[PDB]
Design a protein around this ligand. Structure first.
Ligand SMILES: NC(=O)c1ccc[n+]([C@@H]2O[C@H](COP(=O)([O-])OP(=O)(O)OC[C@H]3O[C@@H](n4cnc5c(N)ncnc54)[C@H](OP(=O)(O)O)[C@@H]3O)[C@@H](O)[C@H]2O)c1
Ligand SMILES: NC(=O)c1ccc[n+]([C@@H]2O[C@H](COP(=O)([O-])OP(=O)(O)OC[C@H]3O[C@@H](n4cnc5c(N)ncnc54)[C@H](OP(=O)(O)O)[C@@H]3O)[C@@H](O)[C@H]2O)c1
Lengths: 358, 353
């Protein structure tokens, strides 16, 4: 059972690689990959693309056909339409699933299979399955979505101020990385101060992508992340660039604004707490609305509050090697009295530093 | 044949690698490595150890002796009286020599028929004596400015891994620089502890060889008192003063006189002053103000930033605060070399160009 240790280690790795092809367009649904082996050859493969599309497990079987009978299904997440009938119907001995269902009492999916004679197992490379759905996994376990907070800084610790979205991030390669990260998030969040001062679009520009351009992401599949903008004071206007983009835009409001907005604009009402809009109840609310993940593009004040409230799951920090002085204000300021470094990479002439809440 | 300029890439590498063995203890002299090859076997090896210890060649040639006659002598840097008598039939120096009035010592051997051919792997030779080379070409010693920061600019209270990392960097420098402001607030030793090194512990750096960097304190107003720990450590500690102090100091305390400039000591003169003083390299340990000033007077050759995974208070100070540094957009800019993990910290290396 050591050969199969490696043998399974391989198909499962493939089944995960497949799952990610869906990472840009799958929200609010998890990513899921499926690989079906018969007598040591892959007879059917599949993964989740769009939200209203049929499951990975199903493409895999519709491709494998009669050849599914013999043996093995590597799935990325415990299977469970009726989707478990589907698997029985085709006739597979053995399924090896990476992680069992995130929610509680629904962890029984495998038992249903065991019952029909199928051999099962869970746990293999589970740690990576976990990584593949950080957001949707957290949403299910806790109320909330996974918040990523991106900061850009110069060596001397300063940033930007009133300069235009285009100058958020200096270098081409860094700009290009940020697009890539935005492109996988469910929502992008931003303050009203930022919209006011910068008139941004906060969209993913498809041209600015590397060789994911081929991966999935045909230009027409392009899915624009949901723009969430905060403002108690209803200061933003129907003419601002941010509401004219394709894609939904959502306002977190403290009280209903009366003006005409286009059909793709919604408002969420949030209670006030010690002066301004209750950040924590926004996060739950967005969780009730199925936001898996929220990528923050804010100034200092907002990044400050999010961190103080302890709602930030990861920090993506971009340092540029340039020095500044006064024009552009500091990067945080914090009175109160948490983090750990994960990946650090070069991004052309900038470095990118990932930190994680854990 | 071109296996000659391929067999050479091997032997010179041994020569460079030997030289390094001396970085900790060599100052104010340069690092130098020599490998004497005959018929395929290295018959003699040597490298510069202490301040006034036998040249690399002297050990390399005593070791080789009679068997020096036949073949090649790979040097790191150009030599000169014992090489000719021992009678080698080819040298390969790595770099011409900085000092640039001289540079005819390699030819002086072509003179004695001995074949020559410099320039090999020169890239790394330069890199081996950054300070010395810098100090020879300009009047100015090489400056590494350490910066400890939290996630949000702002300033040590970084890891022990970081403490041990700086120890090894400290050990490689000729001199350490701090402000009186740091001495007062932290009463430091700014020494090198041998027990904090890792596997330099062995290759050279034997415990009793341990050489303490020179301690330089910028102290305009003579605020630092003769009973602080910094002056009671083993080694020399030199005070940069705007005017003579009248107290009785321990015997290891010297004091360099520097003129005032717009309130404070003039850092540019001080650096030139230290170059006349024979200092190759200065490791700078202080808070944001001095750092701001060094960056702004364009005096810093490289940057070592440690970030810590921590947020500090508002009343924390950092480069991000600080009024004076408006024209920093105009001082010489930097570029990222290497980034790496240090325990729970990252260390980011920035360099000149
Ligand atoms: N990466 C970059 O270089 C980059 C990116 C984005 C923005 N920026 C710059 O940042 C600047 C804006 O900075 P800023 O500090 O003025 O504003 P901000 O941080 O962008 O947003 C402040 C807003 O956030 C909300 N907020 C603040 N504290 C809160 C709290 N404690 N609890 C709940 N909500 C809170 C408030 O919104 P309401 O009052 O509307 O309720 C407040 O007006 C702009 O000039 C922009 O150019 C730079
Ligand atoms: N090395 C480290 O990573 C480390 C370790 C422990 C503590 N610290 C922190 O460092 C902090 C130091 O605070 P700080 O920023 O006020 O002091 P600092 O930058 O370390 O030193 C300021 C001193 O530098 C000199 N100076 C400043 N500007 C100058 C200029 N333009 N030209 C010539 N000389 C100039 C002055 O010395 P004179 O008095 O002689 O005029 C001044 O008092 C401490 O509070 C401590 O907590 C840092």
């Amino acid at each position: 059972t050591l050969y199969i240790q490696g043998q399974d280690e391989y198909y499962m790795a493939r089944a995960l690689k497949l799952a990610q092809r869906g990472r840009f367009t799958t929200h609010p649904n998890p990513n899921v990959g499926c690989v079906i082996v018969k007598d040591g050859e892959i007879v059917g493969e599949g993964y989740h693309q769009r939200a209203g599309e049929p499951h990975a497990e199903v493409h895999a079987l519709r491709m494998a056909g009669e050849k599914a009978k013999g043996a093995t299904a590597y799935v990325t997440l415990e299977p469970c339409p009726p989707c478990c009938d589907a698997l029985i119907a085709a006739g597979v001995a053995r399924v090896v699933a990476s992680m069992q269902d995130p929610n509680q009492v629904a962890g029984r999916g495998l038992y249903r299979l065991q019952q029909a004679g199928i051999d099962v197992s869970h746990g293999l490379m589970m740690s990576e399955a976990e990584q593949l759905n950080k957001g949707f996994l957290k949403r299910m376990r806790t109320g909330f979505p996974y918040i990523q907070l991106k900061l850009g800084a110069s060596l001397d610790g300063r940033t930007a101020m009133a300069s235009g979205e285009s100058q958020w991030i200096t270098s081409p390669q860094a700009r290009r990385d940020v697009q890539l990260l935005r492109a996988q998030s469910h929502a992008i969040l931003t303050s009203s101060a930022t919209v006011l001062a910068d008139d941004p679009a906060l969209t993913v520009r498809w041209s600015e992508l590397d060789e994911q351009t081929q991966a999935l992401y045909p230009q027409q599949n392009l899915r624009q992340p949901i723009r969430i903008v905060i403002d108690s004071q209803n200061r933003v206007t129907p003419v601002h660039r941010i509401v004219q983009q394709p894609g939904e835009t959502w306002f977190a409001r403290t009280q209903e604004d009366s003006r005409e907005w286009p059909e793709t604009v919604r408002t969420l009402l949030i209670p006030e707490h010690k002066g301004h809009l209750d950040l924590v109840v926004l996060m739950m609310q967005l969780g009730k609305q199925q936001i898996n993940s929220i990528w923050v593009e804010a100034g200092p004040t907002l990044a400050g509050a999010l961190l103080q409230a302890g709602l930030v799951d990861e920090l993506i920090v971009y340092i540029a090697p340039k020095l500044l002085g006064s024009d552009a204000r500091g990067l945080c300021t914090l009175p109160g009295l948490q983090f750990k470094f994960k990946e650090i990479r070069h991004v052309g002439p900038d470095v990118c530093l990932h930190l994680v809440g854990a």
